[PDB]
Design a protein around this ligand. Structure first.
Ligand SMILES: C[C@@H]1CC[C@@]2(OC1)O[C@H]1C[C@H]3[C@@H]4CC=C5C[C@@H](OCCC(CO[C@H]6O[C@H](CO)[C@@H](O[C@H]7O[C@H](CO)[C@@H](O)[C@H](O)[C@H]7O)[C@H](O)[C@H]6O)CO[C@H]6O[C@H](CO)[C@@H](O[C@H]7O[C@H](CO)[C@@H](O)[C@H](O)[C@H]7O)[C@H](O)[C@H]6O)CC[C@]5(C)[C@H]4CC[C@]3(C)[C@H]1[C@@H]2C
Ligand SMILES: C[C@@H]1CC[C@@]2(OC1)O[C@H]1C[C@H]3[C@@H]4CC=C5C[C@@H](OCCC(CO[C@H]6O[C@H](CO)[C@@H](O[C@H]7O[C@H](CO)[C@@H](O)[C@H](O)[C@H]7O)[C@H](O)[C@H]6O)CO[C@H]6O[C@H](CO)[C@@H](O[C@H]7O[C@H](CO)[C@@H](O)[C@H](O)[C@H]7O)[C@H](O)[C@H]6O)CC[C@]5(C)[C@H]4CC[C@]3(C)[C@H]1[C@@H]2C
Ligand SMILES: CCCCCCCC/C=C\CCCCCCCC(=O)OC[C@H](COP(=O)(O)OCC[N+](C)(C)C)OC(=O)CCCCCCC/C=C\CCCCCCCC
Ligand SMILES: C[C@@H]1O[C@@H](O[C@H]2C[C@@H](O)[C@]3(CO)[C@H]4[C@H](O)C[C@]5(C)[C@@H](C6=CC(=O)OC6)CC[C@]5(O)[C@@H]4CC[C@]3(O)C2)[C@H](O)[C@H](O)[C@H]1O
Ligand SMILES: CC(C)CCC[C@@H](C)[C@H]1CC[C@H]2[C@@H]3CC=C4C[C@@H](O)CC[C@]4(C)[C@H]3CC[C@]12C
Ligand SMILES: CC(=O)N[C@@H]1[C@@H](O)[C@H](O)[C@@H](CO)O[C@H]1O
Ligand SMILES: CC(=O)N[C@@H]1[C@@H](O)[C@H](O)[C@@H](CO)O[C@H]1O
Ligand SMILES: [Mg+2]
Ligand code: NA
Lengths: 291, 983
């Protein structure tokens, strides 16, 4: 029962060489046939998948709202006096903003100028290869003001006025719809541009609202949000080198030595929120500037 | 203490116990001996409390495997809690679920066995037994427990013998020793040494026997545990329980499963270390992989299948005292059966008649389901009237529901047999005796050897008829005329030797013969003639002979057919009895234990006229072994006897020798069943792999020792038990195959998560919903499959070689069908992820980004950016679809698991429980996917219509593959396909 490794009968583990060869050959052929069947079914399925548009989008829409720097636990904690406490933040920001430099948008067959004011969505055709690659609207770093990184290379972290870059998750064919007739919320918001998807950053709790200082919005135009001429997005196949619009938020009068909970929220008819997904249409960020 | 008291003189008996055999023990000596030597009670077998029985159910092979799985899961959860950040509760859920499954299954099994035990306890009844002791010079009705050694005891008819007695005075005493010695007929008792063996001498009476007639006085020689019954009880109590055959099969299956699980876990632990995970993560992987192989739902499935078989058997008055006993008869290679009370009715019954120069065979069956005899001659009417009127016996109180054979009477066994035979053949005896009132009685006695009687004739003659019955050679001298066809002829030379040619024939069969006569008195006596027995007021000569009646203890009606079926099933049937060899051989020939035409060596020698050594050992297929020989038989000689003879009869065997025979049969590698009823069968019943006791004729100790009870004493239930055991073995194979198939699609998702770094295709919640959910009813429904061929035409399985679970089943479930099921789930997983934007190539190595809770812009194949919760919802939808796909491909697995050799088109779809199980599992899968709130309670999400259709080609592939495999098995018996895949 426990002594089968070798035997007089030339039986390795119970079977002879011929029996082992036959059983192993059977399993090799069987698994080869199974692998062939699996590959064939996968290819047949992939034949039904469009290369320009996903079959379903109900799980990716409405899009999420994210921010740069890519922080670990929605926490930004640094000391302005110590240049190594925000070096990771500044490096993350500069790595993100490398493709937004003017020198990287020079090809006129790829990029184009789509105005210096917010505009309506640009229809570039249908989701196919009728006209090859679509052109990409340019986005200038100068729109980001003091968070542009062209004059201050630390983005306000050395001064104690940190910058965050807000972005909306890309969805193919999604055209944001701004709120109708200024009927979402009230603040000193220039929410009168029908070509901007408004974004606002407020204190999370009533304690936080009194400790957040002035919030500065930097982007295209005077309305804080995303200009609509960058939509719809046609995918990485039709529109490689696509640049999504950016909104820069700088906190210039934060209370020091305290952890501040901040909620940034986007508003729109097709922009939704959830209690399960803390990043859908909004996000939370905690910022502590230590003296 | 029957060692020498029978061969002791009447003076040494008085000296030994310091008592005088006319006055008895002093009234204080009895109390002194009672308080110095204990009471007169056999110690009962030890009683186990209820909680110990429940804890015995909680542990055991399968339960210990699930306990180990739960402990490993708890250890893994503890490691994750101590070292990891925000661990999930998968392992805690698994620990709790495994523990709950074990506890519930134990509760179910305990409840079933407690129900059987309660039925047995209800059957057992206590009535205060009291004895008659000559203490203080007068009669006392003391309790049976207060009888002491040396006490002087008087026993009358109908009294249980209070203890082992050495008889000193007796007057026509007869006792029934059938339960203790296996002798059906009552044994005469005399106060004299007759045989060397205490069990054969006529001057010893034993405890737990019944005095039938007469009266006797004796001295108590053994009390309590020192009695013959008490020593048998101690011998029974000193025996180990033993492991049932199905428990060994479950143990082997657990060994195989443990080996497979450990091998997989260690190989993937090494792979995880090579891939650069870390020792702690590798340990977690190892524990998870090992636990995933444990089939926690199969324990409940096996318990339910055993319970269903037990209830099916209980429907036929066959009580099993544990669930494991429900299978043992299917694995039985040898049946060792007692004769008296087990194969035989243990009741004196009319067997033959001789009148009109003809021998008639009576119907000895209990229900009268046999062959009748000629009842047209008026000689038969005269014989019936005589045998029914000169009887002195009568039924007891109420037995009208019972058949006539099973009814109780009041009188001698011969008188009761004659009464029953006349009642069930001629007419009611009560009406006959009302129409023929008695006048003179003249009771029977031994010296006269006849029973005369006078009755008022029914034919309205106003006169009387004398009726005489007695010994044939005794009543023949009184009758000078016989009755041939109702014609009162005279004594011829022919009708004085045909009487001696039939008496020597009916007496040569071991039967008890009787003669009957009548006179039809002259009319001079009118009606109220004074009939005085003390004188000759009535003629007692020239009687008219009628016929002879013989009686013998017959077999039970169902016994011969049951023995024939068991021998057709390849089972060896051995008779082990404590009765005389002639009776044992006659019964063995009558029931088919000794087949027609087979001969013994002592008969071949007498036929060929050669010495027993010269007898060839090829025509003596039958042997009769005397118990005296077994005292000088070694293990080697016993093995030779048991191996060299197909047909064996053991006669005059003690309980110890029956135990020795059972042990010798087991030592040769056989699974042994023992059927017995008396106290002399208890050690063999306990030592047997399966012990079967008669419910009605059995004794309390034998019913305690047995694993199975025939409540109606129906021997046809043994054939049913063999068939049900074989069928339950086959259906357990099918159910285990079905359950083990789904293991592969449940662990391969985690294996590919570890090796390929893809999002997890199947979750713990969905795995639990498969094992304890959609798979339970389909697995149970395979217990209702009918046999694919004639199972009773098979030979008994070889326990050493034929296993319930072997490598063929593992190769079929793990290697072939489970792999196809696993590929079906991965196909659906990939189609869903590709339709949501993640092409299959882009999912390789995405684990670190996919699982990052703070990466909320993960990019798909189209450039879309996903949040962590969004992609987690997609993953949970993929897991729900994987679960549904496993459900769909289990339809085909259930269809192909219905048969092991036959095609579906040969066996059909007559199993309604299987169809219901398919519908129920489909509805359960649909309910968990589309019910609102199931996305929060579980992580289960609604599915698209097309996502249900992804597993259809794989299910069809499974069906076609299994159909072709079984076709090849059928076409090529003993071929390569059958040797590798036929599990
Ligand atoms: C997780 C995923 C899923 C897929 C997958 O993994 C990945 O799933 C995995 C699952 C895998 C299969 C698992 C199993 C086997 C083993 C071997 O097949 C058994 C070969 C041996 C099995 O051993 C027997 O032999 C033992 C004796 O040695 C016997 O036991 C006695 O042992 C004592 C003496 O020792 C006695 O005294 C005791 O009475 C008694 O205990 C008992 O019969 C049995 O143990 C030998 O078989 C012999 O059986 C007969 C022996 O006479 C002959 O007829 C004939 O010579 C030969 O057939 C061939 C490989 C194969 C098919 C694997 C293929 C690959 C997979 C499909 C993997 C695959 C990749
Ligand atoms: C007669 C017969 C007898 C037999 C039988 O039938 C009847 O008897 C029956 C008796 C049954 C058991 C009865 C009772 C339970 C307890 C139950 O307890 C789960 C409770 C759930 C908790 O509820 C909430 O949890 C969160 C709370 O905050 C909510 O979060 C969101 O909302 C928040 C704000 O509200 C935001 O802050 C969050 O950010 C945002 O997410 C969430 O929406 C909501 O669901 C469990 O949820 C988790 O599910 C997975 C668990 O591992 C986790 O996945 C993890 O493992 C996966 C692989 O497994 C990997 O793939 C994943 O990557 C990895 O993460 C998953 O992450 C996690 O959610 C689990 C099932 C079980 C054992 C049953 C099994 C089946 C039976 C044995 C039946 C059996 C058939
Ligand atoms: C996809 C379409 C629907 C599914 C169709 C499936 C059809 C087959 C499925 C099940 C049938 C069992 C497996 C196939 C067996 C075919 C070979 C066969 O029938 O054996 C006959 C021969 C000789 O006869 P014998 O052994 O009786 O006598 C000689 C005795 N002597 C060898 C033992 C000592 O034995 C031998 O050569 C044994 C040596 C050869 C062993 C390797 C054979 C590999 C062939 C097929 C493996 C599976 C391929 C299909 C996989 C489908 C994926 C689902
Ligand atoms: C590399 C590793 O991957 C992830 O963790 C992995 C290990 C562990 O955490 C669990 C949750 O306990 C394991 C667990 O071990 C074993 C299982 C209960 C097992 C069984 C099913 C069954 O029926 O019996 C056993 C199959 C996988 C399993 O269902 C879960 C699946 C989710 C997972 O989370 C996966 C995390 O991302 C983690 O953080 C990271 O370190
Ligand atoms: C090949 C066939 C037999 C597979 C089974 C087909 C049917 C029974 C399956 C496939 C798709 C499923 C349906 C999918 C969609 C819905 C809508 C939902 O709001 C209720 C359940 C319902 C109505 C399901 C009913 C059952 C259904 C499970
Ligand atoms: C509008 C705004 O917030 N920024 C301006 C900018 O011209 C100047 O550089 C900054 C101090 O650095 O103060 C102010
Ligand atoms: C924006 C600005 O320059 N004014 C702030 C004022 O709002 C704040 O109350 C004060 C105390 O923190 O510091 C200064
Ligand atoms: Mg008996
Ligand atoms: Na037993």
């Amino acid at each position: 029962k426990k002594f089968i490794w070798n035997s007089e009968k030339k039986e390795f583990l119970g079977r002879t060489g011929g029996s082992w060869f036959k059983i192993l050959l059977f399993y090799v052929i069987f698994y080869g046939c199974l692998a062939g069947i699996f590959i064939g079914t996968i290819q047949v399925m992939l034949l039904t998948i469009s290369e320009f548009k996903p079959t379903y989008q109900d799980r990716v829409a409405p899009p999420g709202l994210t921010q740069i720097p890519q922080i670990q636990k929605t926490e930004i904690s640094f000391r302005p006096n110590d240049p190594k406490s925000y070096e990771a933040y500044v490096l993350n920001i500069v790595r993100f903003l490398e493709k937004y430099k003017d020198s990287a948008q020079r090809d006129d067959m790829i990029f184009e100028d789509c105005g210096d004011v917010p505009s309506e969505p640009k229809e570039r055709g249908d989701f196919n290869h009728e006209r090859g690659e679509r052109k990409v609207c340019r986005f200038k770093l100068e729109w980001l003001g003091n968070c542009s990184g062209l004059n201050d290379e630390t983005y306000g972290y050395k001064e104690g006025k940190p910058c965050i870059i807000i972005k909306l998750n890309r969805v193919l064919g999604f055209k944001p719809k701004p709120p109708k007739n200024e009927s979402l919320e009230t603040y000193p918001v220039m929410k009168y541009n029908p070509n901007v998807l408004p974004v606002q950053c407020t204190g999370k709790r009533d304690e936080d609202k009194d400790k957040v200082g002035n919030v500065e919005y930097f982007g295209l135009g005077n309305s804080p949000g995303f200009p609509l001429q960058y939509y719809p997005y046609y995918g990485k196949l039709l529109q490689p080198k696509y640049l999504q619009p950016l909104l820069a938020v700088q906190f210039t009068n934060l209370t020091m030595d305290t952890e501040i909970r901040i909620e940034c929220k986007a508003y729109g008819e097709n922009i939704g929120y959830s209690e399960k997904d803390r990043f859908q249409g909004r996000f939370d960020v905690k910022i502590e500037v230590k003296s | 203490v029957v060692m020498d008291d029978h061969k002791l003189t009447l003076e040494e008996l008085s000296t030994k116990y310091s008592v005088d055999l006319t006055k008895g023990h002093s009234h204080q000596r009895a109390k002194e001996i009672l308080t110095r030597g204990g009471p007169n009670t056999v110690t009962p077998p030890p009683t186990t409390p209820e909680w110990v029985k429940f804890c015995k159910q909680l542990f055991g092979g399968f339960s210990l495997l699930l306990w180990t799985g739960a402990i490993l899961c708890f250890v893994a959860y503890s490691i994750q809690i101590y070292f990891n950040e925000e661990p999930t509760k998968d392992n805690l859920y698994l620990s709790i679920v495994l523990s709950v499954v074990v506890i519930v299954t134990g509760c179910f099994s305990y409840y079933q066995e407690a129900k059987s035990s309660k039925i047995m306890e209800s059957f057992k009844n206590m009535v205060p037994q009291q004895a008659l002791v000559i203490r203080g010079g007068e009669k006392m009705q003391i309790n049976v427990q207060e009888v002491v050694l040396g006490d002087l005891v008087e026993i009358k008819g109908g009294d249980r013998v209070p203890a082992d007695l050495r008889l000193i005075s007796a007057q026509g005493c007869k006792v029934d020793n059938s339960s203790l010695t296996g002798e059906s007929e009552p044994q005469s008792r005399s106060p004299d040494f007759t045989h060397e063996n205490p069990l054969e001498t006529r001057n010893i009476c034993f405890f737990s026997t019944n005095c039938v007639e007469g009266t006797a006085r004796g001295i108590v020689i053994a009390t309590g545990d020192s009695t013959v019954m008490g020593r048998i009880a101690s011998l029974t109590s000193g025996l180990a329980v033993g492991q049932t055959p199905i428990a060994a099969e479950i143990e082997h299956f657990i060994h195989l499963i443990t080996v497979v699980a450990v091998f997989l876990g260690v190989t993937f632990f090494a792979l995880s270390l090579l891939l650069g995970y870390g020792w702690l993560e590798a340990i977690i992987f190892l524990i998870g992989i090992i636990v995933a192989n444990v089939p926690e739902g199969l324990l409940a499935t096996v318990t339910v299948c055993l319970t269903l078989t037990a209830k099916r058997m209980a429907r036929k008055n066959c009580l099993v005292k544990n669930l494991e006993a429900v299978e043992t008869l299917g694995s039985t290679s040898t049946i060792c059966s007692d004769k008296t009370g087990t194969l035989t009715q243990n009741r004196m019954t009319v067997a033959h008649m001789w009148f009109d120069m003809t021998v008639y065979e009576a119907d000895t069956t209990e229900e009268q389901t046999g062959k009748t005899f000629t009842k047209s001659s008026d000689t038969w009417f005269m014989l019936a009237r005589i045998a029914g009127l000169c009887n002195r016996a009568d039924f007891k109180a109420n037995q009208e529901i019972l058949p006539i054979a099973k009814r109780a009477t009041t009188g001698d066994a011969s008188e009761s047999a004659l009464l029953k035979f006349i009642e069930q053949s001629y007419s009611s005896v009560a009406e006959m005796r009302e129409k023929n009132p008695k006048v003179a009685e003249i009771p029977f006695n031994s010296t006269n050897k006849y029973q005369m009687s006078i009755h008022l004739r029914e034919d309205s003659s106003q006169t009387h008829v004398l009726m005489m019955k007695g010994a044939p050679e005794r009543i023949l001298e009184f009758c000078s005329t016989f009755l041939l066809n109702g014609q009162e002829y005279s004594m011829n030379d022919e009708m004085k030797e045909a009487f001696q040619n039939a008496y020597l024939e009916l007496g040569g069969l071991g039967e008890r013969v009787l003669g009957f006569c009548f006179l039809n008195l002259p009319s001079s006596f009118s009606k109220g003639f004074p009939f005085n027995t003390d004188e000759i007021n009535f003629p007692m000569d020239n009687l008219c002979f009628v016929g002879l009646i013989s009686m013998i203890d017959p077999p039970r009606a169902a016994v011969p057919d049951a023995v024939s079926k068991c021998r057709s099933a390849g089972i060896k049937v051995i008779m082990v009895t404590g009765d005389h060899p002639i009776t044992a051989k006659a019964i063995a020939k009558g029931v088919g234990i000794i087949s027609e035409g087979t001969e013994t060596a002592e008969e071949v020698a007498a036929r060929l006229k050669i010495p027993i050594s010269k007898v060839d050992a090829s025509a003596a297929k039958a042997i009769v072994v005397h118990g005296a020989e077994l005292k000088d038989i070694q293990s080697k000689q016993l093995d030779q006897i048991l191996q060299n003879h197909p047909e064996i009869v053991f006669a005059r065997t003690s309980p110890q020798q029956k135990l020795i025979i059972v042990e010798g049969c087991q030592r040769l590698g056989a699974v042994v069943a023992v059927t017995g009823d008396g106290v002399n069968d208890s050690p063999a019943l306990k030592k047997a792999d399966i012990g079967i006791a008669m419910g009605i004729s059995g004794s309390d100790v034998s019913k305690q020792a047995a694993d199975m009870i025939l409540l109606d004493d129906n021997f046809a239930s043994i054939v049913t038990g063999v068939e049900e055991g074989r069928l339950i073995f086959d259906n357990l194979k099918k159910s285990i195959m079905y359950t083990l198939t789904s293991n592969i699609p449940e662990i391969t998702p985690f294996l590919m998560f570890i090796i390929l770094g893809i999002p997890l295709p199947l979750g713990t919640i969905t795995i639990l919903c498969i094992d304890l959910g959609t798979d339970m009813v389909p697995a149970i429904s395979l217990a209702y499959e009918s046999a694919e061929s004639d199972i009773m035409k098979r030979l008994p399985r070889n326990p050493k070689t034929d296993n319930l679970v072997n490598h063929r089943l593992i190769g079929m479930a793990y290697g072939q069908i489970g792999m196809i099921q696993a590929l079906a789930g991965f196909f659906t997983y990939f189609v869903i992820l590709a339709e949501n934007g993640f092409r299959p190539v882009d999912l390789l190595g995405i684990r670190l980004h996919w699982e990052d809770k703070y990466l909320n812009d993960l990019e798909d194949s189209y450039g879309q950016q996903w949040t962590y919760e969004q992609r987690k919802v997609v993953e949970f939808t993929c897991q729900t679809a994987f679960f549904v796909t496993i459900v769909v491909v289990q339809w085909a697995d259930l269809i192909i698991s219905k048969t092991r050799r036959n095609s579906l088109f040969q066996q059909g779809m007559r199993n309604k429980v299987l169809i219901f199980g398919i519908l129920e599992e489909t509805l359960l899968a649909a309910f968990l996917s589309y019910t609102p709130g199931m996305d929060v309670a579980l992580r289960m999400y609604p599915l698209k219509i097309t996502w249900w259709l992804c597993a259809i080609p794989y299910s069809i592939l499974i069906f076609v593959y299994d159909e072709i495999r079984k076709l090849l098995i059928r076409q090529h018996p003993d071929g390569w396909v059958e040797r590798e895949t036929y599990y």
